[model samples]
Target: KDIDGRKPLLIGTCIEFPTEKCNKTCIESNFAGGKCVHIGQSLDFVCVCFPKYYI
Candidate 1:
């Protein structure tokens, strides 16, 4: 029963930090990984993280 679901954890903006670094933060928090993403066409840069089990 693998539905392949992933949950997102918003961690501030890339302006304050780098995307690669965001991945480290997520891993430290027990998440699978993290990356910078854009919301819509706006300048909203967010660090999104996905959990291992749910993914």
Candidate 2:
């Protein structure tokens, strides 16, 4: 938490899955590791949707 804008502390996706979905379909589709959280604000904003992990 700093000035004009703050970073979200996390990041996401090759965009394989839209982070906006959270239900049976998302789960069934195996898109349940986490949600997209990319912000281009930090050096960790790697857009990887289903790698069991993200920056």
Candidate 3:
């Protein structure tokens, strides 16, 4: 089992349309880090945010 607690949180929809590139500036600035992901069942890409808890 994983011991880390850095689970990603969904910030919001990053893009309404599909695209290869994603802008993580908003998510990065707000959270510790960020990622762009597209769910297979979903159409729009969502912003995945990671909080800073490693200390």
C-alpha RMSD for every candidate: 2.2, 10.3, 4.8
| Model 3 lDDT tens row, 1-55 | 2436476777566764222222354344455566567789777578766656534
- Per-model TM-score, in order, reads 0.76, 0.23, 0.48
Candidate 1 global Cα RMSD:
2.2
**Highest-TM-score candidate:** 1
Whole-model Cα lDDT per candidate? 0.77, 0.36, 0.55
Off by over 4 Å in 2: 1-14, 20-32, 39-55
For lDDT, candidate 1 versus 3, the one ahead is 1
Steric clash pairs (candidate 1) = none
How does residue 47 of candidate 3 score in lDDT? Answer: 70
Looking at model 3, residue 51 earns an lDDT score of: 54
Ranking, lDDT, top scorer first = 1, 3, 2
lDDT of 2 by residue, 1-55 (tens): 1233222222324244454442223344444334545456754323332322222
In model 3, the clashing pairs are none
Looking at model 2, residue 17 earns an lDDT score of 41
What tens digits encode model 1's per-residue C-alpha lDDT throughout 1-55? 4746567777768777578888888888778778888889997888878877663
What number of clashing residue pairs does each candidate have, in the order they appear?
0, 6, 0
Tell how far residue 3 is off in model 1, in angstroms: 5.5
Model 3: lDDT of residue 46: 84
